[PDB]
Structures are given as C-alpha cells and as structure tokens.
Amino acid sequence: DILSLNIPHDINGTERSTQKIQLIVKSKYGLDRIVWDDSALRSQGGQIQHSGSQSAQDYQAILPAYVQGGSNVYKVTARAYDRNGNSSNNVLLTITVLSNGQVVDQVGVTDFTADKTSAKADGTEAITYTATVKKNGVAQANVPVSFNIVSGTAVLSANSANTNGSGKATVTLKSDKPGQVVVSAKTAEMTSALNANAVIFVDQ
Ligand SMILES: [Br-]
Ligand SMILES: [Br-]
Ligand SMILES: [Cl-]
Ligand SMILES: [Cl-]
Ligand SMILES: [Cl-]
Ligand code: NA
C-alpha cells in the first residue's frame, strides 16, 4: 500500500544484446530510485545499467557472451525506494542468454553432438548423435526432431525421433565409405537445421 515493485516479465535475449527491463512501481510517497544486485551478470561481463533517460525506473540489461556448456541463466534482484526511505520487496529478475545462432521463444535444437569423432568405414560401427531441444534454455519434451545427412555418404538409423523428458532425441550413423559426414537436426519451428560437427569414417 505504501510501496510495491513488480517485474512482470523475465528477459530472454541474444548474447551481448541490450534488453529493456519493464518495472511496475506503485508508490504513495513517490519513487526515488531502484537499487540492483546484478553480481550474477557481472560474473560473466554483463550488467544492469540505467538506460540514460530521465526516469528513475528506466533500466536495461547488457547480456554477457554465451557460455558453451554453461548455465546462461542469471538471477538478479531489484529493490525500489521511495522519497521517505521505505523500500519494496527485493524482486527477482531472471535473464537467460541465447547464443547468436538461437531464436528467442522458439522450440529449437540447441545442441547436436556425436559420441565419437571417427569410426571405422565398415558399415557396422555406429556414431550416435544426440539433439537437445530447448525454448529459452528450458528442455522441451516430446518434440519431433528431423535428421538429415547434409554431406557425405552414410546411412541414418531413422529420419525422425521425438525428444524424451529431458529434451533429447538420438539417431545413429554408419558408413561403408571413408570420408567426412555432416548430419543435421531440425524441429518444426526452426528456419533451418542445425549441423553437427563433421565426423570422419576411416579405413583400417
Ligand atoms: Br509480477
Ligand atoms: Br523439422
Ligand atoms: Cl514490493
Ligand atoms: Cl577410427
Ligand atoms: Cl519446433
Ligand atoms: Na516476474
């Protein structure tokens, strides 16, 4: 009744982008300032800063670079103060960082990796690929993933599989010919498939 702060929306954005923060303040005596703990962002070189306008509630987040294999989720807090020195609750804002190649709010393949970098070219040894599907960093269950050989000569065990409860779908690759092979994974919302790193089948 005297002073409240609400943050209606968390932030999901591309690494190194600037993201405006929406604050909703109600203050009987008048807002004086917002005070932030952004130490989680600063651990990776991001920050929360005033947008430079004349408004005491106009802030933005500078997102850090994406950390491969990292959390990429940053929890920061804001507290409003009024002109009498009262404060609001210390309110949580969650900032999730996506890599340059990913799309905010999309159900998309974020990772597509193989268990081996090489295999024998005997048409028998299998390289197993795992695709992870997330939306804003959260794994998505039961999503169909389409698999395709982009280049090279090989055979996929299947052309589509649905993700499990951990957001993962798998397929195997075999080849009778030596050479490099690139396999890709895609979900329906993506604009193009995500290529895995090349693997090589070797004669021996
Ligand atoms: Br809220
Ligand atoms: Br697809
Ligand atoms: Cl509050
Ligand atoms: Cl090998
Ligand atoms: Cl999708
Ligand atoms: Na919120």
Residue numbers in the entry: 452 to 655
From the paper:
Intimin is a 94 kDa outer membrane protein, essential for the intimate attachment of bacterial cells to the host cell surface, followed by actin pedestal formation. Intimin is classified as an inverse autotransporter, a subclass of the type 5 secretion system that transports the C-terminal extracellular region or passenger through the lumen of the N-terminal β-barrel located in the outer membrane. The intimin passenger forms a rod-like extension consisting of four tandem bacterial immunoglobulin-like (Big) domains (subdomains D00–D0–D1–D2) capped by a C-terminal C-type lectin-like domain (D3). Here, we describe the crystal structures of the combined intimin domains D00–D0 and D0–D1 from the EPEC strain E2348/69 determined at 1.5 Å and 1.8 Å resolution, respectively.
The structure of D00–D0 has an elongated conformation, spanning 78 Å between the N- and C-termini. The subdomain D00 also exhibits an IgSF fold with a β-sandwich, yet it shows distinct structural differences when compared to the s-type fold seen in subdomains D0 and D1. In addition to the two common β-sheets, β-strands A1 and B2 form a separate small β-sheet due to shortened β-strands D and E. The presence of a third β-sheet in an Ig-fold is not novel as it has been previously described in Ig-domain subtype C425. The β-sandwich of D00 is additionally disrupted in strand C by a short α-helix induced by residue Pro515. A structural similarity search with the D00 structure on PDBeFold revealed similarity to the outermost extracellular domains of several Cadherin types (EC). The D00–D0 connector adopts an S-shaped conformation connecting the D0 and the D00 domains through a hydrogen bond network and solvent-free dry interface. The tight interaction between these two key residues leads to the formation of a classical type I turn in the connector. The asymmetric unit of D00–D0 crystals contained six molecules. The sidechain rotamer of all the implicated residues and thus the hydrogen bond network of the D00–D0 connector region is conserved in all six molecules. OLIGOMER results had a better fit to experimental data (χ2 = 2.45 for merged file) and revealed that the majority of D00–D0 is present in the elongated conformation as shown in the crystal structure.
